[PDB]
Write a protein that binds this DNA or RNA. Structure first.
Ligand SMILES: [Mg+2]
Lengths: 407, 555
DNA sequence: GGTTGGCGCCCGAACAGGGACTG
DNA sequence: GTCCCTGTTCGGGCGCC
């Protein structure tokens, strides 16, 4: 608490100009309550139209709580803030945090406020609280302290951060800690119970300054699968030739040449085909290739992480992470038993994002299987994080809907 | 006065200087009329006369306003606005009568000479220089700059809404139980008080306002239901719109049609059942707005339907946050929907239509999904929560579709309502192939050069067609082959196509497309008793998508 | 009858994707 | 890359303030 560090927008970009979206009474009551206090404290100052910039805000109860958490969707500003979350940031990603038995997710943004923000950078941090039924004009605010949600925030409170743990870290050469933005990721292999009470003991190596479950090495990869049948049909073989055809771009060796010649001429769809010798011994082999991992796929921390999702139905959604199309760093399923399609899919992007942070230390840009209007009407009702991944909306072919089918 | 309030700092966009625009000529009858205006305004510190050391000038015309034959000053700051900084606009939306809770006592009052009661930042003041034209070339006209918020400058609205807020805050703190709706210089003020004490609180507001330089004339609707606010009449227990009058016109120009759609839309907020889809189709014509579009007799039906609804007395009521919100939707024509939001039967907070075509291809369960999305976001704005829904669709149909559809789709809490017509899926694709039915291997093929293509099929029972299409494309020949096969198959068919595009459209179960072909394909689909649609890798020599492909590729 | 800001409904023009092409 | 085709956004008319 004193004087501050110079910042700048990526060489050429201008500040954020995003509209505030409508909010529910509850998210607003919460918000003016929160912002009244940060005004009394001097973390946010009140501004007016002369500031051309805006970023959205809503608020989330981080779980089953009465405490509301302000979330400023700095997505745009972060995207526009100068290269230094890679360039001035020191953090290598401790490859082994994903290897641990237990990891706990730690919210610590409310510790960013301690630090003054450049005098000239404040204006970009501007955001507007709505009024319901538009009884008043928007009430505008600006930041005088490192904002939670902004990516410049941990890239500054880092020297301090690297300090704040000097003891607890030294005193624990086998508990690993990672700082991605608002959240702090700490986990150890310790037993289920003495882990919990070792995290709790970090709150104290914390609280003296100020101020949920998740087990990593068990997000099992999900395989690409072929239906075995005692009897095949023209339609069954044509679907088989369809999947393997495609898969043959992710796996080079997959051949379909013997199966495609069982489709010799214009058979009716339900006619049964006696699988021949080479036939059965081509898909028998093909089903072997689908066992082996993809060879030669490596994360580029420079390049962009891309999650991609498909609705399989029955609360089961399949996903790939990948940077070059077809070279998936991972593939998985979010199986839910037996239903809100939208809560489902928003939760699917939180589980995935975490994994991404945990495994690669950044977040994907998602390509979602939902219509913009739909996603946007409802998704903040189920969000629970402090980060927000980029996304964009996709109109998928029903084919890829059908390349990750189980049974 | 001048509000004692602090100016709001204003800058020109970087690198740009003020306006240097030539005062263009005006009648002496304005030139006198403007001198009359620019004299009292000068008398009252709103404008300062400037010398020749102000390089700038922007054009100021004048026009008589609203049946008075009184002139009203007006500057054209179009250039200053270009050079002015950006602002963040603070007016986010428009207050709606239905988010109004029933108060015991109501007052509406407007703020007089509002923009001119607010100081403009002095260092920006000089860019507002305008000159009032001597009757010709003759005299160098009078130079003036602006001391308050000019009419017609990009910044003035915002900076005034902002100031208004910042002035009302003190009063709002102290009267937390006085509700003040604040639209530009308009004030609705409501309380759960007996008029006497209510009335006091008001004068107490007007004194606060007066102490800040804001005069509250007497266009004050005192003890006066109906109050006229934001376009509506407010009565103590019901609200309504001030009368709408659709232009009864002989020869509709297109823009005349946009003017008609406009009033209907505005009417659609309290008059249930307003239809506009037929009239917002006559519009589908890259256009001269001057152009004269002939009235479609289908639209003709619609307008007639509306003009009739408009003769009905309607009203809304006010919001009780004690109770819940409840929306009823109604499928009321080809992609025209209607709804009403209530808290007690036959008492309509408001109503509304949906009738948007999202997609080149859509169906009822999509749209009724879209219209529910719209009503959700609207409800959040007016009441800040989402209504319970009552929809004319049976849980059955929804799940059939949430099932076949491969993009997540959703609807909240909703009770079935048997308010027919009910939303139905017009046909359904089989999930597995149809035993023993004829199997059409279809394909088509175009020629990017000549735009000539072929579409046709080959089948297990032995028959084949090939047909040649002029001025077509691959995706249309793909779609041709699937319609050809549909035309020629009995009441049960299997179709194998190599087109990821054709597969995509039809698997989504359209019942309505801007494409005549997909409509020709839909009419067939509705006629079969079963259809199975299979996909296959093109050019991979599947039996027998290779023969269809071999016959069809003379393109 | 030549000016400003807001929200809404429309339209089309510009885009950005994705698939399918091409010799 | 070029076609298409689909989905956006963005202006612009109108409505109302
Ligand atoms: Mg083809």
């Amino acid at each position: 608490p004193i004087e501050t560090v110079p910042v700048k927008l990526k060489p050429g970009m201008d500040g954020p100009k995003v509209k505030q979206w409508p909010l529910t009474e509850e998210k607003i009551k919460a918000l003016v309550e929160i912002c009244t206090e940060m005004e009394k404290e001097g973390k946010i100052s009140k501004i007016g139209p002369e500031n051309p910039y805006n970023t959205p805000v809503f608020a989330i109860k981080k779980k089953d709580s009465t405490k509301w958490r302000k979330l400023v969707d700095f997505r745009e500003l972060n995207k526009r803030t100068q290269d230094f979350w890679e360039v001035q940031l020191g953090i290598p990603h401790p490859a082994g945090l994903k290897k641990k038995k237990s990891v706990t997710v730690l919210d610590v943004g409310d510790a960013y406020f301690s630090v003054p923000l450049d005098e000239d950078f404040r204006k970009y941090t501007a955001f507007t609280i709505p009024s319901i039924n538009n009884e008043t004009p928007g009430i505008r605010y600006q930041y005088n302290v490192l904002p939670q949600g902004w990516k410049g925030s941990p890239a500054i409170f880092q020297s301090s951060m690297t300090k704040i743990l000097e003891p607890f870290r030294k005193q624990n050469p086998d508990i690993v800690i990672y700082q991605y933005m608002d959240d702090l990721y700490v986990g150890s292999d310790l037993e289920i119970g003495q882990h919990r009470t070792k995290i709790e003991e970090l709150r104290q190596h914390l609280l003296r300054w100020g101020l949920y479950e998740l087990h990593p090495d068990k997000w099992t990869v999900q395989p690409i699968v072929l239906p075995e049948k005692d009897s095949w049909t023209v339609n069954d073989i044509q679907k088989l030739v369809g999947k393997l055809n495609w898969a043959s771009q992710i796996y080079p060796g997959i051949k379909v040449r013997q199966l495609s010649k069982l489709l010799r001429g214009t058979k009716a769809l339900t006619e049964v085909i006696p699988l021949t010798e080479e036939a059965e011994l081509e898909l028998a082999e093909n089903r072997e290739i689908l066992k082996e991992p993809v060879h030669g796929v490596y994360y580029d921390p420079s390049k962009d992480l891309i999650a991609e999702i498909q609705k399989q139905g029955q609360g089961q959604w399949t996903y790939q992470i990948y940077q070059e199309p077809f070279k998936n760093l991972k593939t998985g399923k979010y199986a839910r038993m037996r239903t809100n399609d939208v809560k489902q899919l928003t939760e699917a992007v939180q589980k995935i994002t975490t994994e991404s942070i945990v495994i690669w230390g950044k977040t994907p840009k998602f390509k979602l299987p939902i219509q913009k209007e739909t996603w946007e009407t409802w998704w903040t009702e189920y969000w629970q994080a402090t980060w927000i991944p980029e996304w964009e909306f996709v109109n998928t072919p029903p084919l890829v809907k059908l390349w990750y089918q189980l049974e | 006065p001048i509000s004692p309030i602090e100016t709001v700092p204003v800058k020109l966009k970087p690198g740009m200087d003020g306006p240097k625009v030539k005062q263009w000529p005006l009648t002496e009858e304005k030139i006198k009329a403007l001198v009359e205006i620019c004299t009292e305004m000068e008398k009252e510190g709103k404008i300062s006369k400037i010398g020749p050391e102000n390089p700038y000038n922007t054009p100021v015309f004048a026009i008589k306003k609203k049946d008075s034959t009184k002139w009203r000053k007006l500057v054209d700051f179009r250039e200053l606005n270009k050079r002015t900084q950006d602002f963040w606009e603070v007016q986010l939306g428009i207050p709606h009568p239905a988010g109004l809770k029933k108060k015991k006592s109501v007052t509406v009052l407007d703020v007089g000479d509002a923009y001119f009661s607010v100081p403009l930042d002095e260092d920006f003041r000089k860019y507002t220089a305008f000159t009032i034209p001597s009757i010709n070339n003759e005299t160098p006209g009078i130079r003036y700059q602006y001391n308050v918020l000019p009419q017609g400058w990009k910044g003035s609205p915002a900076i005034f809404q902002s100031s208004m807020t910042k002035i009302l805050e003190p009063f709002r703190k102290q009267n937390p139980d006085i509700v003040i709706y604040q639209y530009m210089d308009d004030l609705y003020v409501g309380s759960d008080l007996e008029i006497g004490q209510h009335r006091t609180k008001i004068e107490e507001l007007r004194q606060h306002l007066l102490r800040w330089g804001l005069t509250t004339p007497d266009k004050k609707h005192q003890k006066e239901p109906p109050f006229l606010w934001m376009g509506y009449e407010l009565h103590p227990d019901k609200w309504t719109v001030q009368p709408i009058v659709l232009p009864e016109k002989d020869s509709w120009t297109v823009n005349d049609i946009c003017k008609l759609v406009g009033k209907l839309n505005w009417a659609s907020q309290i008059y249930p059942g307003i239809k506009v889809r037929q009239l917002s189709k006559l519009l589908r014509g890259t256009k001269a707005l001057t152009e004269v579009i002939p009235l479609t007799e289908e639209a003709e039906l619609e307008l007639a339907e509306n003009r009739e609804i408009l003769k009905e007395p309607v009203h809304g009521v006010y919001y009780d946050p004690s109770k819940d919100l409840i929306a009823e939707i109604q499928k009321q024509g080809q992609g025209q929907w209607t709804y009403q939001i209530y808290q007690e039967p036959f008492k309509n907070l408001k109503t509304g239509k949906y009738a948007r075509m999202r997609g080149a291809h859509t169906n009822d369960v999509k749209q009724l999904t879209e219209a529910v999305q719209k009503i959700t976001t609207e409800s959040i704005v007016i009441w800040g929560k989402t209504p319970k829904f009552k929809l004319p669709i049976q849980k059955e149909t929804w799940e059939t579709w949430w099932t076949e559809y491969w993009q997540a789709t959703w609807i909240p809490e909703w009770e079935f309502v048997n308010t027919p017509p009910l939303v139905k899926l017009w046909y359904q694709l089989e999930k597995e192939p149809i035993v023993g039915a004829e199997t059409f291997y279809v394909d088509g093929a175009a020629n990017r050069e000549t735009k000539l293509g072929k579409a046709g099929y080959v089948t297990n029972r032995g028959r084949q067609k090939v047909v040649t299409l002029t001025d077509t494309t691959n995706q249309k020949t793909e779609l041709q082959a699937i319609y050809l096969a549909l035309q020629d198959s009995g009441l049960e068919v299997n179709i194998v196509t190599d087109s990821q595009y054709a597969l995509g459209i039809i698997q989504a179960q359209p019942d309505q497309s801007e494409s005549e072909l997909v409509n020709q394909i839909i009419e067939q689909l509705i006629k079969k008793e079963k259809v199975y649609l299979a996909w296959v890798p093109a050019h991979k020599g599947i039996g027998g998508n290779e023969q269809v492909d071999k016959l069809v590729s003379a393109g």
